[PDB]
């Protein structure tokens, strides 16, 4: 059960990727969307993350590495990467394994760390954020 704010983040991110004719919806598009998702934003702020810099690093990477669909192709559209699909499934699995159903942007943030070859996970660790930092925030606040 993805909560309302998470679904809104996911759907708007997918719509923007489609408007930009991006061939793929990546974990980086995902993390970028999460910067304005209240649940994930709060976790990042508790980890003293420079959200302005992370936003810029994500946007630049997305523009430089995401292939753009030609105007000629009208049969295939923006699709999620395998890595993106795994992150959402992992977020749902993590929450259900604790006996709950509500999946928030913060839970998705936690799931991103397991995609070790993703630029999003690399950038989070570059900003000195670990998976445990986010889990501790979800459990204990501060």
């Amino acid at each position: 059960m993805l909560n309302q704010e998470l679904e809104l983040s996911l759907n708007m991110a997918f719509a923007r990727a489609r408007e930009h004719r991006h061939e793929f919806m990546t974990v980086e598009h995902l993390l970028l969307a999460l910067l304005s998702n209240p649940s994930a934003r709060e976790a990042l702020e508790a980890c003293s993350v420079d959200l302005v810099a992370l936003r810029q690093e994500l946007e630049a990477f997305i523009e430089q590495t995401t292939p753009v669909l030609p105007a000629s192709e009208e049969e295939r559209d923006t699709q999620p990467t395998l890595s993106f699909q795994r992150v959402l499934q992992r977020a749902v699995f993590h929450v259900q394994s604790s006996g709950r159903n509500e999946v928030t942007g913060a839970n998705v943030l936690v799931a991103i760390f397991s995609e070790q070859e993703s630029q999003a996970a690399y950038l989070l660790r570059k900003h000195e954020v670990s998976r445990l930092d986010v889990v501790n925030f979800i459990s204990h606040g501060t």
Binding site: M1, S83, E115
Partner: protein
């Protein structure tokens, strides 16, 4: 459309080469189809790459991030499977 709930030093992730491997079953026409459909090549360049796969045994289709490369490889292999060709697509660190 998508259904979201039913689909020391740090080094950045490496870029990956996406490769097409030769076999004796896959028609040249299908290899070209794959190059145009999944790699956006025009007929001419796709034909050259097809010939490289044919003579050299394998050819690099493109270089992408680890994340994009993994997806492209899965898409190509699924398309080959649906069309009943043993066309093998792989990836390798750039």
């Amino acid at each position: 459309w998508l259904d979201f709930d039913q689909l020391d030093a740090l080094k950045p992730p490496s870029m990956y080469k996406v490769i097409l491997v030769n076999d004796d079953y896959t028609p040249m026409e299908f290899v070209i189809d794959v190059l145009q459909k999944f790699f956006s090549y025009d007929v001419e360049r796709a034909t050259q790459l097809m010939l490289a796969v044919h003579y050299q045994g394998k050819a690099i289709c493109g270089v992408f991030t680890a994340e994009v490369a993994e997806t492209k490889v899965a898409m190509v292999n699924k398309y080959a499977r649906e069309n009943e060709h043993p066309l093998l697509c792989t990836l390798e660190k750039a």
